[PDB]
Amino acid sequence: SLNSTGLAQAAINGLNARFYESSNARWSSDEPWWISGVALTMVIEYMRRSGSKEYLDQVEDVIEVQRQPLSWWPSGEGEFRADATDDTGWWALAMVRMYDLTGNEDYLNISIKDEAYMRQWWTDTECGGGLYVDIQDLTYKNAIANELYLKLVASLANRAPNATIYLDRAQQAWTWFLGSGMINGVNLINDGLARDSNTGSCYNNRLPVWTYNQGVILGALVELYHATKDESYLLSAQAIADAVLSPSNGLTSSSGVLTETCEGSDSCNQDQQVFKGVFALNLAELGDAVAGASSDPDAGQDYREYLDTNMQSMYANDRSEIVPTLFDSSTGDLYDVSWSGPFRNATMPKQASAIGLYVANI
């Protein structure tokens, strides 16, 4: 009764009608630049899963303009190399998807440049590995920057020419992530690592458990399996996803609705408004991998059911439509942060996360 393809296209059109800036080939310049890359990922993935190409022209426009040297980080020399390794990671993975959609080697080359760039801040001398997120300061090895990097080298191991060096890098990277301690006692991932003032050893800093730090790692473990056929990577990804699905861990509501930790206090900032959809998309990649690796028809049924349960809740309770005019005949759908709570406002990060859930069900 619910077409995930029709509703994704409607949410994409709502994203464009309210937040796309033709003058700047970017969505919402008042919102973080990296969230435009998350948005590009969702539009690229919609097209990759629905066989459609309606936004291909728009996507290429964004790519060409955001390719250029960033005004706030000229030293990066463009090609999405920014002042933060996670900012670069989001665009790099969007280019892996651009390559998956079009087959154009140009986008794969961007991802290779981005990996070499991010690897510049991998050090074995602190925490025994991992990279920093703050390229200027180098004081925080967190979860998202390392998850993004891990999925980049894992992705290149399946696509890039010198796959071997990327497979060795991805295997050594997952090993570091596993032993870092960021995966806690319930198989969830806190925000990052803290470092001992005296001993220099690193530990889980017990900062909040964000939804997207439970998703990007799933995509990485999926790609790590497609490059090794070692189902052990899938089982690790299933442990993380299963913990997100358990309501005892606080991320899944009693209704079965994914709930960001900030939604209760209504303090979800521009970053946190987009987290959920990144997880959903990555969970759909896990569910797809689990069902293909096993003959059981029920393989990945829980992950599919979860995405379906969350999509109907976001549709019924979180949706709003745009008012068409005699001048603007633009149509689509708008969405708020709470996939169960009421629609009050729509922001571009909230919109990108909604698109991600619909695309996760295509």
Ligand SMILES: OC[C@H]1O[C@H](O[C@@H]2[C@H](O)[C@@H](OC[C@H]3O[C@H](O)[C@@H](O)[C@@H](O)[C@@H]3O)O[C@H](CO)[C@H]2O)[C@@H](O)[C@@H](O)[C@@H]1O
């Ligand atoms: O005491 C509160 C928490 O303190 C530690 O958490 C921090 C942060 O996790 C981490 O983020 C880097 C941080 O650097 C600046 O000093 C700070 O001003 C901020 O802008 C920036 O995000 O810094 C260190 C490294 O993890 C760490 O001290 C936890 O260890 C824990 O004690 C508490 O949860």
